[PDB]
Amino acid sequence: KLSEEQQHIIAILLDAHHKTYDPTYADFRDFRPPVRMSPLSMLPHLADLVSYSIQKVIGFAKMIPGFRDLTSDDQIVLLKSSAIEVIMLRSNQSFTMDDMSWDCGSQDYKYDVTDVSKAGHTLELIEPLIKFQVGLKKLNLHEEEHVLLMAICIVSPDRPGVQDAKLVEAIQDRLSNTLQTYIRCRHPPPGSHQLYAKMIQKLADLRSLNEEHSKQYRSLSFQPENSMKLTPLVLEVFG
Amino acid sequence: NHPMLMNLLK
Ligand SMILES: C=C1[C@H](O)CC(=C/C=C2\CCC[C@]3(C)[C@@H]([C@H](C)CCCC(=O)c4ccc(O)cc4)CC[C@@H]23)C[C@H]1O
Structure with a gap:
């Protein structure tokens, strides 16, 4: 069964996401x-x-839940490495298959392949980024599943520089188990079919997207004029 | 080494 602690966890993650994601x-x-x-x-x-x-x-x-028990250093390591991945994941909400674009409410705020290209990023990133968005959209996740995936991505124990891995794993496992159990009790077939494994596969796709993002970030950054147009938070987090 | 990220995490 889905336990009250697990039902609590979902509740928290849905509200946490509602407070941090403005659909307007x-x-x-x-x-x-x-x-x-x-x-x-x-x-x-x-x-x-x-x-x-x-x-x-x-x-x-x-x-x-449990993220606050981590050392500040570990909070920092986990955010640094996952930020781009969670941004890719959360962007699925604005991504539309209708015309393969991120539609943020108005044509000025609707972004496409050419727009991302005009941001200094090549097709090496963009072609597989869009693939990723289509494949994730096709899962048609419950919002509950969406928020759990983002949280599981953030609390990964294998991120380099991770000190208390055992504790990081204990947090993620709690979220993973919450997600497995939710799919079984709440996700009707055939949507539920291999859905956990397919979601996990997306975490692997994101690593590769992240790797590529880093290489292109590093290339763009070598030129200081580009770096000038970034923000201080972006320089701190991306490097 | 991450002043801003640290401030936003606190
Ligand atoms: C609120 C949200 C999400 O948080 C973010 C949204 C979309 C995100 C997108 C869709 C459009 C293109 C986005 C922003 C990707 C870009 C590759 C980022 C490009 C800008 C960039 O990060 C960069 C540029 C130059 C440089 O030297 C270093 C970095 C990264 C993720 C991509 C829309 C919306 O649903």
Whole structure:
């Protein structure tokens, strides 16, 4: 059965996500304006959206049950390494198969392959990023599953620099078991079929997306003019 | 070594 502690965990994660994810996208007006015309034209706007999305991910992270028992150093390690992955995951909510784009409520705030390309990132990242978004959209997760996946991604014990791995594992296991059990009791077939394993596979796809993101981040960063257009939080978190 | 991330995590 799904236990009251597990039902509690889901409750917390749903509310945590509701408080950190605004489906109206009202704050996007604070970002430097988008420019689609112009090389690296989209960079200030998307750097700002990523920066924001980093803060919101931290807000979600803090509210994950057991995350607060970790050492600050370990909180930091886990956020640093997962941030881009959770941003990719949470972005599925605005991603639409209708036209393969992230639709954030208005054409100024709707982003596509060419827009990401105008942010300095190549198809090496973008082609497999979009694949990832289609494959995840196809899962048609319950919101409950969505929030658990993001949390399990954040609390991973194998991230490099992790001190108290045993404790990190104990937190993630609690979330993993919560997710397995939820799918069995709440997810009707055939949607539930191999759904856990398919979700876990997505965590592996994200590692590879993360690896590629890092290489391209490092390349773009070597030039200091690009780095100038990023935010301080983005420089601190991405390196 | 992460002043801002630390502040937002606190
Ligand atoms: C609120 C949300 C999510 O948090 C974020 C959303 C979309 C995220 C997207 C869709 C559009 C493109 C996004 C932002 C990806 C970009 C590759 C990020 C590009 C900007 C960027 O991070 C960068 C640029 C230059 C540089 O030297 C270092 C970094 C990373 C994740 C991609 C929409 C919306 O659903």
